[PDB]
Amino acid sequence: GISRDSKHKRRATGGRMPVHRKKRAFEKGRPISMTKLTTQSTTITEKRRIRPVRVRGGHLKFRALRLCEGNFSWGSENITRKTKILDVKYNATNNELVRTKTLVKNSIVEIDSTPFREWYKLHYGIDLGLKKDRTVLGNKEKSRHVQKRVKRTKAQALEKNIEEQFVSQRILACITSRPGQSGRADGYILEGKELEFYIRKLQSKKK
Amino acid sequence: MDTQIQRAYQKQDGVFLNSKKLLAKKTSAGVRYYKNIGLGFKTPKEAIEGTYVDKKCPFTSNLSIRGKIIKGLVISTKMNRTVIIRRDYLHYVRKYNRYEKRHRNIPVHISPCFSVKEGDILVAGQCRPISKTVRFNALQVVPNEIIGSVRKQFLLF
Amino acid sequence: ARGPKKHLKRINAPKSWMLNKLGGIWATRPSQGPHKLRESLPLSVLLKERLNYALNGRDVTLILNDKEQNVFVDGKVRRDKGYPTGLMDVVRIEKTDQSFRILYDTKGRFVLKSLSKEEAKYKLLKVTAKAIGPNQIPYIVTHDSRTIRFPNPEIKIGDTLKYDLVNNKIENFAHLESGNVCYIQQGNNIGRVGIIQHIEKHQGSFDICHVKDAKGNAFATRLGNIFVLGQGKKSWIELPSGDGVRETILEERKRKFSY
Amino acid sequence: NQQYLLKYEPNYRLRKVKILGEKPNTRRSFKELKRKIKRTSGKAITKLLSEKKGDTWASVQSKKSDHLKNFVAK
Amino acid sequence: MKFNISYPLTGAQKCIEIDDDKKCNIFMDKKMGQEVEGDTLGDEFKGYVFKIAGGNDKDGFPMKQGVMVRGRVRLLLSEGHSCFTSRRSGFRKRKSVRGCIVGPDMRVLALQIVKKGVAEIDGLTTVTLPRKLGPKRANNIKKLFGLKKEDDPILIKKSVIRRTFKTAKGKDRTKCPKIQRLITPERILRKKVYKA
RNA sequence: GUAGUCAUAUGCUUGUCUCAAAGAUUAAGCCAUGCAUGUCUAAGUAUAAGCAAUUUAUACAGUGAAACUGCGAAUGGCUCAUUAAAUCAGUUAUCGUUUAUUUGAUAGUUCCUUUACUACAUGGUAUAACUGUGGUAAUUCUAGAGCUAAUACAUGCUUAAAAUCUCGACCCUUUGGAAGAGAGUAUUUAUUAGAUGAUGAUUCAUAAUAACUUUUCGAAUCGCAUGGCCUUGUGCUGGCGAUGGUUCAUUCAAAUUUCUGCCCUAUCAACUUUCGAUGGUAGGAUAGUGGCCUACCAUGGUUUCAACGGGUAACGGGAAUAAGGGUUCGAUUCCGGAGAGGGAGCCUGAGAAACGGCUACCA
């Protein structure tokens, strides 16, 4: 009965505070649920594991214990595909969560560019594989291929950081979902303000 | 680089625009969360063109204000964006048919927008519990001068 | 507390039921329905102590359980010892084709008004909330916990509708604004009926309202307690105890024993 | 209709006109059968039940019914 | 060690008392439901194969497949367990039960006859039980009489079974069961009604 | 002084009439003896006379045995023992939280396999109950044999083609004809709505939106009402309810929650910070708010209006008349927290800090 009643505290004026009530059941406090990653099945066969907990109202709440694949969205483009997350880096909350590759709502991680690479290719005619072969278009320029241009000319100035990411195969993104609460793990792809920044934490972190 | 990192590990907004804004390369991109609690309250000029990321603000967040609204003098400036206001009222005494003085202390949250100072009258609103004590946010600040002891100062404001 | 209450005490059951103090110890507890606990009249009360058609407790048990169906509430059959018949309702006693209004006194006691097959058709509904829901559609809701689909758009949240039960059709509504007639569903002033004077909103969380009536008395109550009994002076239903207006203990005496 | 009167009036008002009859002491035994039954498996329970002081409602009816047919007049 | 030996196939319930020690010595240190070679009973059991059906201690304590321990252990039982009855979900109880491993402490061991041998036991082969309950679900009925799916109800109605008996009252009645699952017009009416 | 004591004091003991009080008061001394929350049909399960009691529905009458059910059995009721604590009072909506109960409402986009969709003349199971075979100092015991249900498991194409959604030309006037216009949700994020509901209020909705979710959704109901429709078997006709589901608010709630108020005490001065004393923050729990914690740091701030703090066994406190007066009430606490050997863990669930569910441990 790990409770959370604010009784076992000390009122403003730090004087101990009285109790007449045994711990009451609605102050429930469930066992924490650290969330790891299977981006290393060196031991861990069963890729992802999610256990459902019977919550109050009568509903179920799925709890993420072990995972390997989540869903992520590229802010800029409005694209979202399910991908395989790689390694967790910098958890902010604490560095131990990174050491155990645990999944916090706001844990910054890596993903496979594959789905985004695949897409950025189909909609712009730009693979993002090593720079030289850059574009891959059609043979004749009379029909609908005229659009991959129109979009491509949209000065798709995807930050020098977004570019490097793709080619390296790794992609930076933060999460936005309580695994211990919904069982999933969804995140947005890192960019501008935070990208530049979180990276800094990483550059200086190792150096 | 300052308002963003400054120790803490990140500071976005409720309306996650940012980096995506680079998509609307012509109009105004520098959006920040804008609001208006209303209830006959003006929204601070400073609140709008600020870089501050205070989730516990009543103009920069999905923090509501409901019912109880307060006016009280300020005691301390210490604490991170939190202040203690002291209210001074009289209590009646059934028997002797007279009053005595009394003071309740209140934990108030202060969005960066308005600038504090010790010993000034402040107006708090009733916002959801933000912490053990906090349950009030500042909405309107009036600067005032008290030459010395804030404790000595007792006004049926 | 253990869980959720489930009974009710003689002593604790509302003065609106004009109940028997010596009676027993309990009292039929209203069933979760269209009207709130305090603002309601469970059938058992309605027939036993009210109409007096029933009597002993088992008397009811027959009436509402008998395969004949003797009780109707707003054009529907009811067989629950304590269905909470609320304000502005229409109850029909099958076996006699009796039609009643569930309305409060002027002294705040639940009164049964006899209606003609005519009014028994229309029932007055007050508007709870108003917002648009699923697939671009407008919904209105009445105190009577009625949920309305595609309602006339000229209807503000604090409105009052006239309902044709027979066709489950609306007709002639009327919001609350300076210059209407109203009934107060609850308060130190319930059972009164007058002309709305003006509605001062204070937003801080509680708006108020004023009123006048027959002897031109000044009335004060919170909006939530105003029910628009009609638009511009003409009331829409026959009121109990003559007109919705109470007398000084002094006026009662002079009217009755003429002092 | 005495045929209505017979359906509505209380079982106690009927024994009073000497139409329904007796009111034997149920309490004690019923409380004692609860005793046994609460401690058995269906097998015997059924049997026991075939011994709980009479006066079924099904019984009350047949007796009510008999007053029905056998009576006519005024 | 007394034996409650049951024979599936026919429904033969027999009880054997085996006093001498030497015979039973084969059941020692064997698990629940193992394959018994009942030749350590040269008597009436010449070439037989049993399954150790269950256990009972000198104190009425049954066995619990799984709890592999030659002795009694005490556990908390939840629904879904044996030697445990319900009555209000979570009737969790500290009930004590006898292990899965067979021991000399065992008083009664039940057995299930898999393959009988040349030998012949009276209580077992002498039986011919007239199991009383014939199919009752529409589908189970036809499954016994043939009748492919397409087969109309009325067919199954008159294709059911009936039972006659004489009552302790010297009475002669005829009884028969309802067939929940029978596709009637009513069921059909309702479905159209619903989609209407 | 006085006697009386209208002092008792208890100390002596007698027709007809009743609004009618009596181990909380000691210890919050517990279970002698007596004792004990289960249950019903329009309604879900009963034998073609082995529940079977008739009696002759008759292919499933009642009729019930028993079971299955499915329900409540988190209700109280006694218990301050605590508790100087918001306990509690007001005094908070809860943009911060959960919600049976009750209604109201209510749900076309599930294929589209590249319709032997099989074909829904609505699936599969599984089981009891049940007959039996038993065991044992002996169980709410239980064994092994068989049974059968089913409103329970477990399902499950929704065709009859080109499903059904969603433009609409167009006339063709209505029957509209409409061409050919185009095509569901619990669970996720991620954007966009939202200019064109709402708030002071919104990143609000309820929108979408994709994705992508071991994830849903979705009446293999029963009940009478089967006589109208055409067909003539037909197709219906389902009527109407029972029996569901759906989400919303529908009371149900709680659950917070401001905003006034316990005894004294300054001979309380000071207090509170190792993780919380504060802020603020990352997460995580939490069902879901919260230092509640993980961190991570802010130093906080409380306070003579005595704060830290101390001391008051403290469980604890609604009606109305009323020139004046007359009077009186709710009824031995309206109110309202903490115990049901010790401890532990666990239990139900809409819904328990489950007393009177466990366990297991102790006793």
PDB file of N, CA, C and O (backbone and C1' of nucleotides) in Angstrom, chain B residues 15 33 36-37 64-66 68 76 78-80 82 84 102-105 109 132 154, chain F residues 92 94-96 200 202-203 257-258 260 276 278-280 291 298 300-301 303-305:
ATOM      1  N   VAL B  15       2.267  25.423 -26.509  1.00  0.00           N
ATOM      2  CA  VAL B  15       2.023  25.373 -27.962  1.00  0.00           C
ATOM      3  C   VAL B  15       3.371  25.181 -28.648  1.00  0.00           C
ATOM      4  O   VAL B  15       4.055  26.131 -29.024  1.00  0.00           O
ATOM      5  N   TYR B  33       3.070  31.499 -26.281  1.00  0.00           N
ATOM      6  CA  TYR B  33       1.693  31.257 -25.884  1.00  0.00           C
ATOM      7  C   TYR B  33       1.034  32.512 -25.329  1.00  0.00           C
ATOM      8  O   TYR B  33       1.493  33.119 -24.359  1.00  0.00           O
ATOM      9  N   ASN B  36      -5.583  35.095 -21.894  1.00  0.00           N
ATOM     10  CA  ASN B  36      -6.281  36.157 -21.198  1.00  0.00           C
ATOM     11  C   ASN B  36      -7.276  35.562 -20.223  1.00  0.00           C
ATOM     12  O   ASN B  36      -8.388  35.209 -20.605  1.00  0.00           O
ATOM     13  N   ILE B  37      -6.872  35.449 -18.962  1.00  0.00           N
ATOM     14  CA  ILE B  37      -7.724  34.886 -17.912  1.00  0.00           C
ATOM     15  C   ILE B  37      -9.023  35.655 -17.758  1.00  0.00           C
ATOM     16  O   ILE B  37      -9.968  35.177 -17.137  1.00  0.00           O
ATOM     17  N   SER B  64      -5.639  27.719 -14.934  1.00  0.00           N
ATOM     18  CA  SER B  64      -6.841  28.523 -14.782  1.00  0.00           C
ATOM     19  C   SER B  64      -6.883  29.277 -13.468  1.00  0.00           C
ATOM     20  O   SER B  64      -6.043  29.082 -12.591  1.00  0.00           O
ATOM     21  N   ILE B  65      -7.889  30.133 -13.338  1.00  0.00           N
ATOM     22  CA  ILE B  65      -8.096  30.896 -12.119  1.00  0.00           C
ATOM     23  C   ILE B  65      -9.586  30.861 -11.836  1.00  0.00           C
ATOM     24  O   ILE B  65     -10.389  31.226 -12.695  1.00  0.00           O
ATOM     25  N   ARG B  66      -9.955  30.444 -10.624  1.00  0.00           N
ATOM     26  CA  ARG B  66     -11.365  30.289 -10.288  1.00  0.00           C
ATOM     27  C   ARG B  66     -11.856  30.530  -8.854  1.00  0.00           C
ATOM     28  O   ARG B  66     -11.397  29.909  -7.904  1.00  0.00           O
ATOM     29  N   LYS B  68     -11.859  32.265  -5.690  1.00  0.00           N
ATOM     30  CA  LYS B  68     -11.167  33.102  -4.713  1.00  0.00           C
ATOM     31  C   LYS B  68     -10.090  34.030  -5.272  1.00  0.00           C
ATOM     32  O   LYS B  68      -9.132  33.574  -5.893  1.00  0.00           O
ATOM     33  N   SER B  76       8.095  38.283   1.617  1.00  0.00           N
ATOM     34  CA  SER B  76       9.413  37.915   1.107  1.00  0.00           C
ATOM     35  C   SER B  76       9.558  37.821  -0.414  1.00  0.00           C
ATOM     36  O   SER B  76       8.617  37.485  -1.133  1.00  0.00           O
ATOM     37  N   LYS B  78      12.442  36.190  -1.639  1.00  0.00           N
ATOM     38  CA  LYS B  78      13.203  34.959  -1.882  1.00  0.00           C
ATOM     39  C   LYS B  78      12.329  33.898  -2.548  1.00  0.00           C
ATOM     40  O   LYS B  78      11.154  34.151  -2.814  1.00  0.00           O
ATOM     41  N   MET B  79      12.903  32.725  -2.825  1.00  0.00           N
ATOM     42  CA  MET B  79      12.198  31.612  -3.484  1.00  0.00           C
ATOM     43  C   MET B  79      12.085  31.826  -4.988  1.00  0.00           C
ATOM     44  O   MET B  79      11.962  32.956  -5.462  1.00  0.00           O
ATOM     45  N   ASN B  80      12.102  30.736  -5.741  1.00  0.00           N
ATOM     46  CA  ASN B  80      12.006  30.842  -7.185  1.00  0.00           C
ATOM     47  C   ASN B  80      10.598  31.071  -7.686  1.00  0.00           C
ATOM     48  O   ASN B  80       9.776  30.160  -7.704  1.00  0.00           O
ATOM     49  N   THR B  82       8.083  32.491  -6.397  1.00  0.00           N
ATOM     50  CA  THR B  82       7.075  32.220  -5.388  1.00  0.00           C
ATOM     51  C   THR B  82       7.240  33.273  -4.302  1.00  0.00           C
ATOM     52  O   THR B  82       8.356  33.593  -3.922  1.00  0.00           O
ATOM     53  N   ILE B  84       5.511  35.227  -0.488  1.00  0.00           N
ATOM     54  CA  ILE B  84       4.593  35.132   0.634  1.00  0.00           C
ATOM     55  C   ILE B  84       3.940  36.477   0.897  1.00  0.00           C
ATOM     56  O   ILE B  84       4.609  37.478   1.140  1.00  0.00           O
ATOM     57  N   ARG B 102      -4.703  39.909  13.619  1.00  0.00           N
ATOM     58  CA  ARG B 102      -4.331  38.571  13.180  1.00  0.00           C
ATOM     59  C   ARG B 102      -3.800  38.623  11.770  1.00  0.00           C
ATOM     60  O   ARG B 102      -4.152  39.521  11.015  1.00  0.00           O
ATOM     61  N   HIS B 103      -2.949  37.667  11.410  1.00  0.00           N
ATOM     62  CA  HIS B 103      -2.388  37.649  10.065  1.00  0.00           C
ATOM     63  C   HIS B 103      -2.230  36.241   9.506  1.00  0.00           C
ATOM     64  O   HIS B 103      -1.668  35.367  10.162  1.00  0.00           O
ATOM     65  N   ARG B 104      -2.728  36.030   8.292  1.00  0.00           N
ATOM     66  CA  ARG B 104      -2.622  34.737   7.625  1.00  0.00           C
ATOM     67  C   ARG B 104      -1.503  34.942   6.622  1.00  0.00           C
ATOM     68  O   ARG B 104      -1.364  36.028   6.056  1.00  0.00           O
ATOM     69  N   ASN B 105      -0.674  33.930   6.431  1.00  0.00           N
ATOM     70  CA  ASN B 105       0.398  34.048   5.460  1.00  0.00           C
ATOM     71  C   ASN B 105      -0.010  33.234   4.256  1.00  0.00           C
ATOM     72  O   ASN B 105      -0.652  32.186   4.393  1.00  0.00           O
ATOM     73  N   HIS B 109       2.385  32.318  -6.270  1.00  0.00           N
ATOM     74  CA  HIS B 109       3.287  32.084  -7.377  1.00  0.00           C
ATOM     75  C   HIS B 109       3.360  33.317  -8.266  1.00  0.00           C
ATOM     76  O   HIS B 109       2.346  33.925  -8.585  1.00  0.00           O
ATOM     77  N   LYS B 132       2.812  22.009  -2.276  1.00  0.00           N
ATOM     78  CA  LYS B 132       2.343  21.853  -0.913  1.00  0.00           C
ATOM     79  C   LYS B 132       1.563  23.098  -0.527  1.00  0.00           C
ATOM     80  O   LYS B 132       0.365  23.016  -0.309  1.00  0.00           O
ATOM     81  N   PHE B 154       1.082  47.015   9.234  1.00  0.00           N
ATOM     82  CA  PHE B 154      -0.178  46.297   9.394  1.00  0.00           C
ATOM     83  C   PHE B 154      -1.256  47.234   8.867  1.00  0.00           C
ATOM     84  O   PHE B 154      -1.562  48.252   9.491  1.00  0.00           O
TER      85      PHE B 154
ATOM     86  P     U F  92     -18.055  29.237  -1.003  1.00  0.00           P
ATOM     87  O5'   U F  92     -17.106  28.519  -2.040  1.00  0.00           O
ATOM     88  C5'   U F  92     -16.173  27.563  -1.598  1.00  0.00           C
ATOM     89  C4'   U F  92     -14.914  27.709  -2.384  1.00  0.00           C
ATOM     90  C3'   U F  92     -14.997  27.305  -3.841  1.00  0.00           C
ATOM     91  O3'   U F  92     -15.515  28.340  -4.653  1.00  0.00           O
ATOM     92  C1'   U F  92     -13.094  26.341  -2.854  1.00  0.00           C
ATOM     93  P     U F  94     -12.984  25.756 -11.513  1.00  0.00           P
ATOM     94  O5'   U F  94     -12.588  24.231 -11.318  1.00  0.00           O
ATOM     95  C5'   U F  94     -11.244  23.939 -10.969  1.00  0.00           C
ATOM     96  C4'   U F  94     -10.976  22.471 -10.813  1.00  0.00           C
ATOM     97  C3'   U F  94     -11.497  21.571 -11.912  1.00  0.00           C
ATOM     98  O3'   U F  94     -10.568  21.494 -12.968  1.00  0.00           O
ATOM     99  C1'   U F  94     -11.911  20.626  -9.767  1.00  0.00           C
ATOM    100  P     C F  95     -11.081  21.346 -14.473  1.00  0.00           P
ATOM    101  O5'   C F  95     -11.537  22.819 -14.875  1.00  0.00           O
ATOM    102  C5'   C F  95     -10.932  23.967 -14.292  1.00  0.00           C
ATOM    103  C4'   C F  95      -9.437  23.841 -14.276  1.00  0.00           C
ATOM    104  C3'   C F  95      -8.697  25.160 -14.373  1.00  0.00           C
ATOM    105  O3'   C F  95      -7.379  25.018 -13.855  1.00  0.00           O
ATOM    106  C1'   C F  95      -8.341  23.909 -16.332  1.00  0.00           C
ATOM    107  P     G F  96      -7.107  24.368 -12.419  1.00  0.00           P
ATOM    108  O5'   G F  96      -6.846  22.827 -12.751  1.00  0.00           O
ATOM    109  C5'   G F  96      -6.368  22.442 -14.045  1.00  0.00           C
ATOM    110  C4'   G F  96      -6.349  20.949 -14.265  1.00  0.00           C
ATOM    111  C3'   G F  96      -7.679  20.231 -14.090  1.00  0.00           C
ATOM    112  O3'   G F  96      -7.587  18.969 -14.762  1.00  0.00           O
ATOM    113  C1'   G F  96      -6.236  19.550 -12.400  1.00  0.00           C
ATOM    114  P     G F 200     -15.887  34.143 -19.080  1.00  0.00           P
ATOM    115  O5'   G F 200     -15.075  35.036 -20.096  1.00  0.00           O
ATOM    116  C5'   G F 200     -14.700  36.345 -19.724  1.00  0.00           C
ATOM    117  C4'   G F 200     -13.211  36.429 -19.743  1.00  0.00           C
ATOM    118  C3'   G F 200     -12.589  35.391 -20.648  1.00  0.00           C
ATOM    119  O3'   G F 200     -12.555  35.756 -22.000  1.00  0.00           O
ATOM    120  C1'   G F 200     -11.618  35.214 -18.536  1.00  0.00           C
ATOM    121  P     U F 202      -8.690  30.928 -24.314  1.00  0.00           P
ATOM    122  O5'   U F 202      -7.954  29.880 -23.377  1.00  0.00           O
ATOM    123  C5'   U F 202      -6.543  29.710 -23.426  1.00  0.00           C
ATOM    124  C4'   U F 202      -6.158  28.432 -24.133  1.00  0.00           C
ATOM    125  C3'   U F 202      -6.531  28.389 -25.592  1.00  0.00           C
ATOM    126  O3'   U F 202      -5.693  27.437 -26.237  1.00  0.00           O
ATOM    127  C1'   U F 202      -7.819  26.795 -24.420  1.00  0.00           C
ATOM    128  P     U F 203      -4.118  27.711 -26.383  1.00  0.00           P
ATOM    129  O5'   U F 203      -3.790  27.075 -27.799  1.00  0.00           O
ATOM    130  C5'   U F 203      -4.805  26.422 -28.553  1.00  0.00           C
ATOM    131  C4'   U F 203      -4.581  24.934 -28.612  1.00  0.00           C
ATOM    132  C3'   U F 203      -5.261  24.141 -27.513  1.00  0.00           C
ATOM    133  O3'   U F 203      -5.558  22.840 -27.989  1.00  0.00           O
ATOM    134  C1'   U F 203      -2.905  23.993 -27.273  1.00  0.00           C
ATOM    135  P     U F 257      -7.310  20.363  -0.623  1.00  0.00           P
ATOM    136  O5'   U F 257      -7.218  21.851  -1.108  1.00  0.00           O
ATOM    137  C5'   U F 257      -7.009  22.113  -2.471  1.00  0.00           C
ATOM    138  C4'   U F 257      -7.941  23.192  -2.880  1.00  0.00           C
ATOM    139  C3'   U F 257      -8.468  23.996  -1.706  1.00  0.00           C
ATOM    140  O3'   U F 257      -7.762  25.191  -1.597  1.00  0.00           O
ATOM    141  C1'   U F 257     -10.248  23.021  -2.874  1.00  0.00           C
ATOM    142  P     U F 258      -6.296  25.229  -0.967  1.00  0.00           P
ATOM    143  O5'   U F 258      -6.540  25.960   0.409  1.00  0.00           O
ATOM    144  C5'   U F 258      -7.739  26.669   0.602  1.00  0.00           C
ATOM    145  C4'   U F 258      -7.870  27.774  -0.404  1.00  0.00           C
ATOM    146  C3'   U F 258      -8.369  29.048   0.205  1.00  0.00           C
ATOM    147  O3'   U F 258      -7.348  29.815   0.774  1.00  0.00           O
ATOM    148  C1'   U F 258      -9.797  28.467  -1.529  1.00  0.00           C
ATOM    149  P     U F 260      -9.509  33.625   5.062  1.00  0.00           P
ATOM    150  O5'   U F 260     -10.816  33.730   5.977  1.00  0.00           O
ATOM    151  C5'   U F 260     -10.707  33.725   7.393  1.00  0.00           C
ATOM    152  C4'   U F 260     -12.043  33.830   8.083  1.00  0.00           C
ATOM    153  C3'   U F 260     -12.029  33.542   9.580  1.00  0.00           C
ATOM    154  O3'   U F 260     -11.601  34.612  10.386  1.00  0.00           O
ATOM    155  C1'   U F 260     -13.674  32.237   8.622  1.00  0.00           C
ATOM    156  P     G F 276      14.238  14.256   2.916  1.00  0.00           P
ATOM    157  O5'   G F 276      13.520  15.677   2.996  1.00  0.00           O
ATOM    158  C5'   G F 276      12.484  16.033   2.079  1.00  0.00           C
ATOM    159  C4'   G F 276      11.996  17.435   2.344  1.00  0.00           C
ATOM    160  C3'   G F 276      10.602  17.806   1.858  1.00  0.00           C
ATOM    161  O3'   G F 276      10.122  18.838   2.725  1.00  0.00           O
ATOM    162  C1'   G F 276      12.148  19.224   0.844  1.00  0.00           C
ATOM    163  P     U F 278       8.848  22.121   1.635  1.00  0.00           P
ATOM    164  O5'   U F 278       9.084  23.475   0.838  1.00  0.00           O
ATOM    165  C5'   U F 278       8.340  24.628   1.184  1.00  0.00           C
ATOM    166  C4'   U F 278       8.906  25.880   0.581  1.00  0.00           C
ATOM    167  C3'   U F 278       8.986  25.891  -0.929  1.00  0.00           C
ATOM    168  O3'   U F 278       7.760  26.101  -1.586  1.00  0.00           O
ATOM    169  C1'   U F 278      11.031  26.592  -0.093  1.00  0.00           C
ATOM    170  P     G F 279       7.530  25.354  -2.981  1.00  0.00           P
ATOM    171  O5'   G F 279       8.286  26.283  -4.025  1.00  0.00           O
ATOM    172  C5'   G F 279       8.120  27.694  -4.006  1.00  0.00           C
ATOM    173  C4'   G F 279       9.015  28.322  -5.030  1.00  0.00           C
ATOM    174  C3'   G F 279       8.843  27.712  -6.407  1.00  0.00           C
ATOM    175  O3'   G F 279       8.070  28.571  -7.209  1.00  0.00           O
ATOM    176  C1'   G F 279      11.108  27.559  -5.717  1.00  0.00           C
ATOM    177  P     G F 280       7.302  28.017  -8.493  1.00  0.00           P
ATOM    178  O5'   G F 280       8.416  27.238  -9.308  1.00  0.00           O
ATOM    179  C5'   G F 280       9.162  27.895 -10.315  1.00  0.00           C
ATOM    180  C4'   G F 280      10.298  27.028 -10.766  1.00  0.00           C
ATOM    181  C3'   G F 280       9.880  25.692 -11.339  1.00  0.00           C
ATOM    182  O3'   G F 280       9.519  25.792 -12.693  1.00  0.00           O
ATOM    183  C1'   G F 280      11.703  25.419  -9.856  1.00  0.00           C
ATOM    184  P     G F 291       4.518  18.430  -6.708  1.00  0.00           P
ATOM    185  O5'   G F 291       4.884  17.329  -5.638  1.00  0.00           O
ATOM    186  C5'   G F 291       6.218  16.923  -5.401  1.00  0.00           C
ATOM    187  C4'   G F 291       6.341  16.581  -3.959  1.00  0.00           C
ATOM    188  C3'   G F 291       5.862  17.719  -3.098  1.00  0.00           C
ATOM    189  O3'   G F 291       5.103  17.226  -2.008  1.00  0.00           O
ATOM    190  C1'   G F 291       8.238  17.419  -2.864  1.00  0.00           C
ATOM    191  P     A F 298      20.392  24.787  -4.652  1.00  0.00           P
ATOM    192  O5'   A F 298      19.436  25.882  -5.270  1.00  0.00           O
ATOM    193  C5'   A F 298      19.938  26.804  -6.216  1.00  0.00           C
ATOM    194  C4'   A F 298      18.922  27.869  -6.455  1.00  0.00           C
ATOM    195  C3'   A F 298      18.259  28.372  -5.174  1.00  0.00           C
ATOM    196  O3'   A F 298      18.906  29.509  -4.643  1.00  0.00           O
ATOM    197  C1'   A F 298      16.664  27.387  -6.518  1.00  0.00           C
ATOM    198  P     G F 300      17.427  32.662  -1.103  1.00  0.00           P
ATOM    199  O5'   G F 300      15.986  32.905  -0.564  1.00  0.00           O
ATOM    200  C5'   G F 300      15.526  31.960   0.360  1.00  0.00           C
ATOM    201  C4'   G F 300      14.321  31.271  -0.186  1.00  0.00           C
ATOM    202  C3'   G F 300      13.116  31.427   0.702  1.00  0.00           C
ATOM    203  O3'   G F 300      12.430  32.641   0.501  1.00  0.00           O
ATOM    204  C1'   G F 300      13.479  29.169   0.385  1.00  0.00           C
ATOM    205  P     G F 301      12.923  33.923   1.317  1.00  0.00           P
ATOM    206  O5'   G F 301      11.672  34.335   2.163  1.00  0.00           O
ATOM    207  C5'   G F 301      10.433  34.295   1.529  1.00  0.00           C
ATOM    208  C4'   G F 301       9.667  33.143   2.066  1.00  0.00           C
ATOM    209  C3'   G F 301       9.435  33.171   3.548  1.00  0.00           C
ATOM    210  O3'   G F 301       8.393  34.055   3.901  1.00  0.00           O
ATOM    211  C1'   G F 301      10.141  31.031   2.937  1.00  0.00           C
ATOM    212  P     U F 303       4.075  34.465   8.225  1.00  0.00           P
ATOM    213  O5'   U F 303       4.110  34.970   9.728  1.00  0.00           O
ATOM    214  C5'   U F 303       3.773  34.067  10.763  1.00  0.00           C
ATOM    215  C4'   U F 303       4.793  34.075  11.869  1.00  0.00           C
ATOM    216  C3'   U F 303       5.268  35.424  12.361  1.00  0.00           C
ATOM    217  O3'   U F 303       4.409  35.883  13.370  1.00  0.00           O
ATOM    218  C1'   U F 303       7.105  33.900  12.161  1.00  0.00           C
ATOM    219  P     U F 304       3.732  37.316  13.247  1.00  0.00           P
ATOM    220  O5'   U F 304       3.433  37.689  14.751  1.00  0.00           O
ATOM    221  C5'   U F 304       4.421  37.457  15.737  1.00  0.00           C
ATOM    222  C4'   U F 304       4.097  38.220  16.975  1.00  0.00           C
ATOM    223  C3'   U F 304       4.141  39.711  16.738  1.00  0.00           C
ATOM    224  O3'   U F 304       3.032  40.384  17.306  1.00  0.00           O
ATOM    225  C1'   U F 304       5.576  39.145  18.510  1.00  0.00           C
ATOM    226  P     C F 305       2.482  41.581  16.406  1.00  0.00           P
ATOM    227  O5'   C F 305       0.895  41.550  16.501  1.00  0.00           O
ATOM    228  C5'   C F 305       0.234  40.670  17.394  1.00  0.00           C
ATOM    229  C4'   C F 305      -0.266  39.445  16.679  1.00  0.00           C
ATOM    230  C3'   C F 305       0.770  38.725  15.830  1.00  0.00           C
ATOM    231  O3'   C F 305       0.392  37.370  15.795  1.00  0.00           O
ATOM    232  C1'   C F 305      -1.024  39.282  14.488  1.00  0.00           C
TER     233        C F 305
END
